[PDB]
Amino acid sequence: TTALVCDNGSGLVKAGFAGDDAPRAVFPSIVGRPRHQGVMVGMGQKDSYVGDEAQSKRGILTLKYPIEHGIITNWDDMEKIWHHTFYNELRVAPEEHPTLLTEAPLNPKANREKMTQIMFETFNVPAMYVAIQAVLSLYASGRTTGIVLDSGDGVTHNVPIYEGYALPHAIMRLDLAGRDLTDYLMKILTERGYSFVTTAEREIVRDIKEKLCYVALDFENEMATAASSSSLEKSYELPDGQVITIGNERFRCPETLFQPSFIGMESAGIHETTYNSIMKCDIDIRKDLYANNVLSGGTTMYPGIADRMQKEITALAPSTMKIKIIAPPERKYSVWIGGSILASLSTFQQMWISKQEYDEAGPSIVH
């Protein structure tokens, strides 16, 4: 019987069988629709394109993320990505497998209740479960205690966890993520003269971000590099063949995580949110949380994140105590690994919500 683990974050769907080391199908959550009405006979006609296929044909298509800041914006688009994910990648009837789904904490009740309704009614699933991302990441680490910072494309979380358990009143979500940083890198990029207006080009600048951008230890040093131009300016090649040269924009893109005042948000940077999250927790456990702070997600991948963290949190907190930050490689797939490992635990099998227990007990029993 096994199980399917489906990590539905904005920007990437990671899906695959439980008990395995990595997800098999990893593709973007995009639903491409042709921008220009096309006059051929034979072509497509392909009214809708989905996932990596939409990535193949960006210059025709208007790309549309169905999921924004963790919240599902357009339901039938979502449904398309799931249907494509199941039959065209994993090759599987959902009626043969319980399915573990993922979601951000502190997220509107509509996402659980509609999600579950889709999975039972539209696909037919013998049982399923929807879990909090950060707990899955924490299982992937191999640890029971720690404060998780999960930064994906839609959303960034802090979830403190002590000896199992959890602290819901210290959970802190923040909308800063790969999508905000890509748009911020758009408008900062345009100051060199490089104009990326369209959805398709957004995905190009996502690529630039993913390769080139790094997090400076001290911002001022980056400013000095911008002042004298040596290793900081790097050449990147577009798909067209043009050459972009980016200097300070390389490192002032991800500086937004520490200084959200660059986007015009009053929310304190990710270091003050993690420290703030530690503050709201009981005086006893803070030492462990400081020692054990875990990183997950695509927007933790920027070289130089962990070191700046271990500067900034060490400047906020009392010096007397050790702040080890644990950011393991293969952290982008931490949530999916944790969904896998959780599905392979036998003590979890009682917790699946059954197709039957759903029809009789309602939508109210997902929580």
Partner whose binding site includes residue 47, from Mg ion, ligand ADP, its own copies, none (CB under 5 to 8 Å by kind): none
Residues 189-228 that bind ligand ADP (CB under 6 A): 206, 209-210
Say whether 301 counts as a known binding-site residue: yes
* Contact stretch for its own copies (CB under 8 A) within 215-223, 251-259, 307-315, 342-350: 342-350
Give which of 242, 230, 255, 246 is closest to 191, Cα–Cα: 246
Task: Give the chain's length.
Answer: 367
Q: Could you tell me if 154 and 10 are in contact, meaning their C-beta atoms sit under 8 angstroms apart?
A: yes
* Contact stretch for Mg ion (CB under 5 A) within 120-128, 147-155, 205-213, 263-271: 147-155
For the CB of residue 216, give the shortest distance to its own copies in the complex, in Å. 20
Dihedral (C-alpha) 203, 209, 212, 216: value to the nearest 10 degrees? 180
Give which of 75, 76, 72 is closest to 154, Cα–Cα: 72
Which residue in the set 302, 308, 309, 327 belongs to the binding site for ligand ADP (CB under 6 A)?
A: 302
Say whether 172 counts as a known binding-site residue: no
User: Counting contacts by CB under 8 A, is residue 143 touching its own copies?
Assistant: no
For the CB of residue 151, give the shortest distance to ligand ADP in the complex, in Å. 7
Q: Could you tell me if 321 and 118 are in contact, meaning their C-beta atoms sit under 8 angstroms apart?
A: no
In the complex with ligand ADP, the residue whose CB is nearer, 210 or 330, is: 210
Q: Could you tell me if 326 and 141 are in contact, meaning their C-beta atoms sit under 8 angstroms apart?
A: yes
Residues 277-316 that bind Mg ion (CB under 5 A): 297
User: Counting contacts by CB under 8 A, is residue 170 touching its own copies?
Assistant: yes
Give which of 131, 170, 136, 168 is closest to 279, Cα–Cα: 170
Number of residues that bind ligand ADP (CB under 6 A): 19
Q: What single letter denotes the amino acid at residue 266? A: E
Q: Could you tell me if 229 and 247 are in contact, meaning their C-beta atoms sit under 8 angstroms apart?
A: yes
Partner whose binding site includes residue 42, from ligand ADP, its own copies, Mg ion, none (CB under 5 to 8 Å by kind): its own copies
Number of residues that bind its own copies (CB under 8 A): 77
User: Counting contacts by CB under 5 A, is residue 9 touching Mg ion?
Assistant: yes
CA 191/CA 196 separation, integer angstroms: 11
Q: Name the packing angle between helices 305-316 and 270-280 (round to 10°).
A: 50
User: How is residue 107 written in tokens?
Assistant: 């997220």
CA 247/CA 234 separation, integer angstroms: 7
Cis peptide before 37 (omega within 30 of 0): no
* Contact stretch for Mg ion (CB under 5 A) within 28-36, 91-99, 152-160, 167-175: 152-160
Residues 7-36 that bind ligand ADP (CB under 6 A): 7, 9-12
Per CB under 5 A, residues contacting Mg ion are 9, 152, 297
Per CB under 6 A, residues contacting ligand ADP are 7, 9-12, 152-154, 178, 182, 206, 209-210, 297-299, 301-302, 332
- Return binding residues for ADP: 10, 14, 153, 209, 298, 301, 332
